[PDB]
TrEMBL record, chain E:
The gene is icmK. Coiled coil: none annotated. The keyword Signal applies. The keyword S-adenosyl-L-methionine does not apply. The chain holds residues 105 to 263 of 361 of the full protein. Keywords: Signal. It comes from the Bacteria. This is IcmK (DotH). It comes from Legionella pneumophila subsp. pneumophila (strain Philadelphia 1 / ATCC 33152 / DSM 7513).
From TrEMBL, chain G:
This is DotA. It comes from the Bacteria.
UniProtKB/TrEMBL annotation, chains J, K:
It comes from the Bacteria. This is IcmE (DotG). It is found in: Membrane. Belongs to the TrbI/VirB10 family.
Length: 5, 9, 16, 50, 159, 16, 98, 56, 9, 34, 34, 16, 16, 5, 16, 16, 9, 5, 5, 9, 16, 16, 5
C-alpha cells in the first residue's frame, strides 16, 4: 500500500 | 527479498 | 462534487 | 454467610463454580487484625453420624 | 412526523450497515490480504527452456531437471540426429512428490512437482536403446525447466 | 473516499 | 462469564483440553494457608489464594486473589461509616436523670 | 496497619505465579510439540511404491 | 485510486 | 421512546421485503416460430 | 492480559486456514485432441 | 516488512 | 513509497 | 454522491 | 406541485 | 424528496 | 434526479 | 402527490 | 534466515 | 555436515 | 546448528 | 551470514 | 556421532 499507485 | 504488500510509509 | 475528489486524490498522492 | 468456623472448603472441580467460590471466599483471612473466633466446644460434643 | 426521520435514519443504518464507502474498504482489504495470499516471496524461479546432452557412458551424472510445485515441466527425448524418440515406458520413483502424465504414443513426459522441494528420480524406457534414460528431478530451485531438450547419445527410429 | 492499499485518506470539506 | 467455555459465542479457537473443567477454562482458585499448602478447613487459618494441585494433568492460572468479595464488603462499610458517624452525633450521661 | 501485609500477600501470589511460569509451560508445550514430532516422524516413515506405466 | 461512490461533499 | 424501536421492527421487516423483491431478476424467454 | 489469549486463538484458527490453503496442490489435467 | 529468512526487517519512517 | 522499500531492503541485506 | 448527477 | 419540484431541484444542484 | 446518491434535500413550502 | 411521486406541496 | 393531476 | 538471500 | 535452513546470524 | 551425529554444535555470533 | 556457517562447521569438526 | 562425518 503506497501513494504512487 | 522484499514483499511490498507489507508496505508502510 | 469533483473538488472534494481532487483534493482527496492529491492528499492521497502526497501521503504514500 | 453467618459466622461459621466449621465451613468446609470446596475442593477439586467443584471449586470452579461461583457458588463454591462464595463458600471458599468466606474463609480467606484478611490481615486486618482478624476477630473471627474459633470455637471452644468442638471436641467434647461428638457427632459420628454418617 | 420527526420520528419517521430518526427511525429511517437508523434504518438505512441497520439494514445496509456498511456505507457504500465501507464496502470499498472490505473490497480493498480482501484483495490486499488475498494478493499477499497469492504472493510468492523470494525470487520466483526463472522459467528457462534449456537443452542438455545425455551421455549414457558409465561415470556420467544423470541429467537434472529443476521443477516447482504446481508447475508443469516438459521433457522431450531427441536422438543424436535431433529427431524425436518415441517412448516404450517409464517408471517414476516417489510419484507422490511429482505427478507425471504421458500419452503412450508421444515422446514427451509431462511432470509437475506436487511438493515444494522433495526430490526424486525417474527411469524412461525409450524405443531404440537397451539402456534406459535416467533423470533426477529436484523441485524448488531458482529456475524451472519450462521445457528441456534431452539430446540422447544414441540414434532413434527417426534419422 | 479510500484507495486500494488499505489506508483511509479523506478530504476535509469541499462543496461545488 | 468470559472464563467459561460454554458461553464462547465464537468458535472454540484455543485448546479443547486446556479447560480446567467443563464450566471453567481457567480455575479461579482456592484458599491456601499461610505456609502455602491446601487449606481445607477454617480452623487452619488460610491467608493466600492459589491453584489446585495438578490432577487434570495441567494447572490453569488463577484469575483472583480471593479478596474481591471481602474487599467489596469493605468498600461497602467504608461508605456507610460516614452516615452512621453522623447519626451517632455526653451520649452516655444525660441531664434527663436530673 | 493492614495495607503492607495485603501487599505482602499479593507479593507472595506473584512468587507463586513466577513458579507457575517457571514450571508448567515446559510440560504443556512439550506435549504440543511432541504431538507435532509424532506426525512428523510418521510423515517420514512413509515411503510409497514406485510406478510402472507401459506405452502402447 | 479514487472511488467516487465513497464520496462526500 | 420505544415507539421508534417498534416502528423499527416494522420498517425493517418491510424494507427487507422491498429489497429482495428488487434482487429478483427473472430469466428471459424465447418462442421459436413454427 | 486475556486479550492476548483471544487474539492469539482467533488468528490461530485463521492461520491453520491459510496453511491448508498452502498444502493443497491440485493435479494438472491433460486433455487430448480429436 | 518480513524477509524470506522469517526474521522481520522494516524501515522506520520514509515518505515519498 | 520506494524510500521505505529500499531502506528496509538495505537494512535486511546489512543484517544477516 | 455528488450534486452534479 | 411543480414549484416545489424546481425549489428542490435547485437546492439539490446547489448542495453537492 | 430524495435523490439517488442517498442524501435527502427537500423544499420548504411551495404551492401552485 | 427528482422523484416526483416523492412530492410534497 | 400534486394538485394539478 | 541469511542476509544475502 | 552443516544444515542451514534455520540459519542464525 | 545441529550436525548429523545428533549433537548440537553452534557458532556464537557472526555477521556478514 | 556465512561466517556463522563455517564457524559452526569448524566447531563441529574440531569437537568429535 | 563423530566429528569427522
Amino acid at each position: 500500500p503506497f501513494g504512487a499507485d | 527479498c522484499v514483499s511490498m504488500i507489507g508496505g508502510s510509509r | 462534487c469533483t473538488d472534494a475528489a481532487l483534493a482527496a486524490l492529491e492528499y492521497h498522492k502526497s501521503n504514500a | 454467610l453467618s459466622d461459621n468456623p466449621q465451613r468446609q472448603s470446596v475442593s477439586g472441580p467443584l471449586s470452579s463454580t461461583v457458588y463454591g467460590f462464595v463458600n471458599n471466599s468466606m474463609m480467606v483471612q484478611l490481615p486486618g487484625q482478624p476477630g473471627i473466633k474459633p470455637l471452644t466446644f468442638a471436641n467434647l460434643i461428638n457427632f459420628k453420624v454418617d | 412526523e420527526v420520528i419517521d426521520k430518526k427511525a429511517f435514519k437508523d434504518m438505512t443504518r441497520n439494514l445496509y450497515p456498511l456505507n457504500p464507502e465501507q464496502v470499498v474498504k472490505l473490497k480493498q482489504i480482501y484483495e490486499t490480504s488475498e494478493y499477499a495470499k497469492a504472493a510468492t516471496p523470494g525470487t520466483p524461479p526463472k522459467p528457462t527452456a534449456t537443452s542438455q546432452f545425455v551421455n549414457l557412458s558409465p561415470g556420467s551424472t544423470p541429467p537434472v531437471i529443476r521443477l516447482s510445485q504446481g508447475f508443469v515441466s516438459s521433457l522431450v527425448f531427441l536422438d543424436s540426429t535431433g529427431a524425436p524418440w518415441p517412448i516404450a515406458a517409464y517408471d517414476l520413483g516417489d510419484p507422490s512428490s511429482f505427478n507425471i502424465q504421458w500419452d503412450k504414443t508421444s515422446n514427451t513426459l509431462m511432470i509437475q512437482a506436487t511438493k515444494l522441494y522433495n526430490y526424486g528420480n525417474l527411469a524412461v524406457r525409450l524405443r531404440g536403446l537397451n539402456t534406459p534414460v535416467m533423470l533426477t528431478l529436484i523441485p524448488g530451485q531458482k529456475a524451472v525447466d519450462y521445457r528441456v531438450d534431452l539430446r540422447v547419445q544414441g540414434y532413434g527410429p527417426n534419422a | 473516499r479510500v484507495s486500494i492499499g488499505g489506508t483511509v485518506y479523506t478530504a476535509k470539506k469541499y462543496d461545488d | 462469564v468470559n472464563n467459561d467455555p460454554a458461553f464462547s459465542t465464537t468458535t472454540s479457537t484455543g485448546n479443547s483440553k486446556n479447560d480446567f473443567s467443563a464450566i471453567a477454562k481457567q480455575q479461579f482458585g482456592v484458599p491456601y494457608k499461610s505456609s502455602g499448602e491446601v487449606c481445607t478447613e477454617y480452623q487452619q487459618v488460610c491467608q493466600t489464594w492459589g491453584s489446585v494441585p495438578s490432577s487434570t494433568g495441567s494447572t490453569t492460572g488463577v484469575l483472583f486473589n480471593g479478596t474481591e468479595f471481602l474487599g467489596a464488603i469493605n468498600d461497602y462499610n467504608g461508605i456507610m461509616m460516614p452516615t452512621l458517624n453522623l447519626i451517632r452525633q455526653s451520649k452516655e450521661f444525660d441531664k434527663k436523670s436530673r | 496497619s493492614s495495607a503492607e501485609q495485603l501487599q505482602a500477600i499479593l507479593q507472595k501470589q506473584n512468587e507463586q505465579l513466577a513458579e507457575q511460569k517457571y514450571q508448567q509451560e515446559i510440560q504443556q508445550r512439550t506435549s504440543d510439540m511432541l504431538t507435532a514430532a509424532t506426525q512428523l516422524v510418521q510423515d517420514w516413515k512413509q515411503v510409497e511404491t514406485q510406478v510402472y506405466t507401459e506405452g502402447t
